[PDB]
C-alpha cells in the first residue's frame, strides 16, 4: 500500500541530546504497521526514525515533549 | 512555514481513540507550540500544550504507544 504501512525502513541508533529535535511524531501500531513508529525531525533538516523501545529514545522523547509544552 | 491550527479543540473526546500523536515546537513557522492528535475516525483536533489535562492525556498516549 501506500497511505497504509509501516513509514520507517530502519531506526538511528546512536543516542543524541533532545536540543536537536524540533518537531515529533509517534503513529501507534495498529492496522497499517505492526509496531509504534517514531519520527523526528532534527534542526539540520533530517527527519530520523527511532526505536520506541529504546529507553534512551523514550527519555529524549519526553525531554523534548516537556520542553516544547514550556513554550 | 504556517501554523497548522487555527482554534484548538476543547469538546470532550475519548482519548482512546488517539493514534498518532504530532508535536511541532515554536519557531519561525509559528510562534506556539502546536499539538496534533489524529483520531482513529480519521478527524484531527489542535490541543493547547499549557493545559494541563492535555499535557496528561499526551503523556498517557505516548507511553501506551510505547508499549507497541
Redesign the interface.
Known sequence: AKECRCQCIKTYSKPFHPKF??????????PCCA??EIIVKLSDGRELCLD??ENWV?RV??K??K???N?
Open positions: 529535535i524540533k518537531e515529533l511524531r509517534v503513529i501507534e501500531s495498529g509496531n509504534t520506541p523501545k523514550q522523547v519526553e523534548f515533549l520542553r516544547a509544552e513554550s
